[PDB]
From Swiss-Prot, chain A:
This is ATPase family AAA domain-containing protein 2. The chain holds residues 421 to 1390 of 1390 of the full protein. ATP binds at residues 47-54. It comes from Homo sapiens (Human). The keyword Nucleus applies. Induction: Up-regulated in breast, uterus, colon, ovary, and stomach tumors. Induced in breast cancer cells overexpressing NCOA3 or treated with estrogen. Down-regulated in 5-fluorouracil-resistant derivatives of the colon cancer cell line HCT 116. GO terms for biological process: nucleosome assembly; nucleosome disassembly; positive regulation of DNA-templated transcription; transcription initiation-coupled chromatin remodeling. Belongs to the AAA ATPase family.
Amino acid sequence: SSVRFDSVGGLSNHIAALKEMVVFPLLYPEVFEKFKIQPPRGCLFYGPPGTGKTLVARALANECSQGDKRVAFFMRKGADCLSKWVGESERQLRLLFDQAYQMRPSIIFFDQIDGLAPVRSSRQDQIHSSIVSTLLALMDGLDSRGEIVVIGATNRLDSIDPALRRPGRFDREFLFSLPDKEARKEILKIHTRDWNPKPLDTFLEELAENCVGYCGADIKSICAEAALCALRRRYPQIYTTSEKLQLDLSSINISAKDFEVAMQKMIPASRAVTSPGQALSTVVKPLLQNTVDKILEALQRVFPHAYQPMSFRPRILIVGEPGFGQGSHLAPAVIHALEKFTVYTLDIPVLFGVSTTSPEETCAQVIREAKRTAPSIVYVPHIHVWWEIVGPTLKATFTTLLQNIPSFAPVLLLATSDKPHSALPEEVQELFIRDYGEIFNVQLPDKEERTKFFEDLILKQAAKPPHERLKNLLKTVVKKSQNYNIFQLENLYAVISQCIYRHRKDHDKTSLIQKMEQEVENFSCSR
Amino acid sequence: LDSSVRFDSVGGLSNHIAALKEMVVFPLLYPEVFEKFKIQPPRGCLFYGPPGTGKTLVARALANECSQGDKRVAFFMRKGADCLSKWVGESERQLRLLFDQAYQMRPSIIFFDQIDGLAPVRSSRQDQIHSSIVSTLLALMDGLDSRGEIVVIGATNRLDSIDPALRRPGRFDREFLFSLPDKEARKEILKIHTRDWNPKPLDTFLEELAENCVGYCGADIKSICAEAALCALRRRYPQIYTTSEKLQLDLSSINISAKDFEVAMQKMIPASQRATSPGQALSTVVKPLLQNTVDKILEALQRVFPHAEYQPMSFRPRILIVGEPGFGQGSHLAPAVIHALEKFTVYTLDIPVLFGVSTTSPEETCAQVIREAKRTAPSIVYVPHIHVWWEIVGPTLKATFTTLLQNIPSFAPVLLLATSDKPHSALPEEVQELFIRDYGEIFNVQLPDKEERTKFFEDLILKQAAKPPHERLKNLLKTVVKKSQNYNIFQLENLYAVISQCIYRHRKDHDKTSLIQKMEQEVENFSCS
Ligand SMILES: Nc1ncnc2c1ncn2[C@@H]1O[C@H](COP(=O)(O)OP(=O)(O)OP(=O)(O)O)[C@@H](O)[C@H]1O
Ligand SMILES: Nc1ncnc2c1ncn2[C@@H]1O[C@H](COP(=O)(O)OP(=O)(O)OP(=O)(O)O)[C@@H](O)[C@H]1O
């Protein structure tokens, strides 16, 4: 009840263009008559859940209610205008509009419009058509309602009748996406303003990036869970009492461990489906960063969005012999590093994994959105298998549905295959022009990163408080592992760490060093 | 309610306004000819159309004109459902009272706005109240004890769901179609809304503007001007958005100029194509390359299709366009010819529309669309990429399409447009015989000439080469123009894109011959094929 255009983060264009429907005419009424303007007086909010849409309504109400100029405010729920008696289920609307009009100026806030104004059709009750009829005949009929601002909000945009969406009834539509890296530090700055041990800004600076997929509410919830877990760490015996105790509020400071434990304990909201973009694990990290960075360089060569930068039909392909893990370790890292651009999965488990609908419908739909949210990414894994599991109908549908895409739009098509481009079937080899720079060949890592992979486990992790032969073992294992694929690599790492985990309680070494040896020779990969 | 609308500020509807006053004024102004034959001229109207054309606006203008006049015909209006009453016996009685009051002040006009929510087509599956009110209205609108001389007018926004009975010559005997404005109507409404501007805009500027606003529907142009004004103010005094205080303003540097509409237009989409058309204009970059062949296609079509300007008379126009794959005859030509050929209702018929909606058999859609387009000739039917479309459809749909094409009237002017990549001979016999090439039903495509490519590249290579924040440039132009002799359109576009990339990469450098040398290395390095 005290939020005034300060608790919202990153919403600059929308706020700036929002104050110009309700404040400017009252503040500067000497300009609009100069040209007979009557500026637009309605707009619509919509975006994926948990992005903070009702807060801006709070903001306008709270800010404009108190000040030099006083404007009313009304609020309505989704289906609050329906009652039992037939002739008055609509009469309430007329009474409301009159009521607001006689106290003009004012604002009418419609919340959750989607359950109110469906698409008109004859496969339902006639009553919903009655309400939509009188409603759309009331904003702009024959009487020019005057100074009213109507505001609506919903999650599923397309399920609103195509009649309402034309200027005069609902004017503008606004995108409310997930926050980026910038907005995330902004919001965390906002929610930690009133803290005596003020956390260092460079600390929250690294705190920002690991919070991918987070949106508003998740950030707020984490800010509470951290403090709670700190208390949990501080006076743990509080769960074993049926009576009030005495607590000292001077030793429950907040530390990085609490942040980490809360972070690992909780999960982001976008929970319902899995996002095909993930950060590469710390375990494999010192092995593939060079590869990832090289791929990003090539992508920058072809797709310069990594005066306006301009492109023409951006495409690329990641292929390699099986066991290089190019389809389960490499690509999702590339997407995750390229955040700030929405990603749209399209593969076997999403197509056949959704029933009660046709594959072709969703295949058209996803490209529809990706176009509507340019620039964007379309992702399709395992093409050499994918092209064999679909009927001719879908082949035709997909292969014709992308030519109509405007040529200079920024849409990238990214796919991974395993069989080399020579063995791929025709009609797809025409979709990649590798003379252009549309094919990337992956190769084995060399010795340096190989050694870096094992050295941490085999030197420091091998010597802990709860020794020159180890150099020999390390060099031997490096020597023997120069022609393994990835899978054998992490299998070897797991088997090595398993021995340490087993020899945990033995306080004297030179008991497990032998075991390490036998594991070195007795464990052989198959190749 | 304003007094500023006096039929003067309404453009593009002359045929509907004309026949309309022949129903209200003439029975009173000249009440001697109408009784010469005892005619009782018709007393009903009904409106229907797409969202936004002035349907309610005509009603407003008519009431304004009529009341302030020599005759004082009374006026009324009931909203979509304004007559319902909770009492079992008053809901209908409201109607009778309304008509009765209209009778004592006769002559009168009754306007039912959004009749669709009031008069549904009668059915037994739903409530009785609607089925009773529709009866009560019809029994009194005309029957025993004739109404008198009041006029009943009804404007809706979807048409089908009206009881077919009310569509009889004597309740609703004249149905007026309302359509999207053409170019002339647009250029006239654009004058209308800017009737009083301090700098009066130039006519040619209005023509140039009207050429680009396509699909805009009556009120869209209304909103465009307000957007332009706000953009002008925003650019003019930017420090106004961070103040939250009263400021002083000089109301003389606030003039609206060009480049304001262009920025205003980008942040706007039309009302029709918000839920898209299969018609797109050629982009900025491509027009200088294909304008000539678009013109040539139009000329040939006019030769075969007279309706591309007694009366011109036609017999089953058809046309088929052939080009080698990569010639862009299905991604740059057909949309252009549809878009330039405006004012004809068009209905695409392609795969993502066929198998792209559930809960309907494909043959159902195929029959429905053609039935509609026939009912509203003239029109077009668009079937692109036939040489792939054919082997995809099953035999049953093939047969229903082949037969359902031939039940059209022989002289009904309905055009079918289709393109392919394979030459005509390779096509299957069935579609081969639907085309009679000797009649002039097949048009060829050829790659552009030297001048076209030169005019295509020269703007970027030469006039945009310097662009501050000289003799070698023509050499590069000649070299690249010759090096691209057998390239198709995709190659040419990609070449343009790569040139622009390296131009823009050194946006920051101020010395030349450091990116010109680049330009060379890339061009002789650009071994595309
Ligand atoms: N940019 C932000 N800055 C601060 N808090 C935010 C921000 N975005 C979202 N939030 C938080 O998320 C809450 C959600 O607000 P609001 O109800 O308007 O969201 P919504 O998009 O309508 O969500 P829902 O999915 O519930 O409909 C806010 O009250 C606030 O606590
Ligand atoms: N020729 C025109 N000249 C001036 N204004 C016009 C013209 N055509 C349309 N308009 C404007 O567009 C609107 C006309 O639409 P009207 O009020 O008749 O209902 P509608 O929007 O067509 O109805 P619905 O909600 O069924 O789509 C008015 O705001 C009017 O100012």
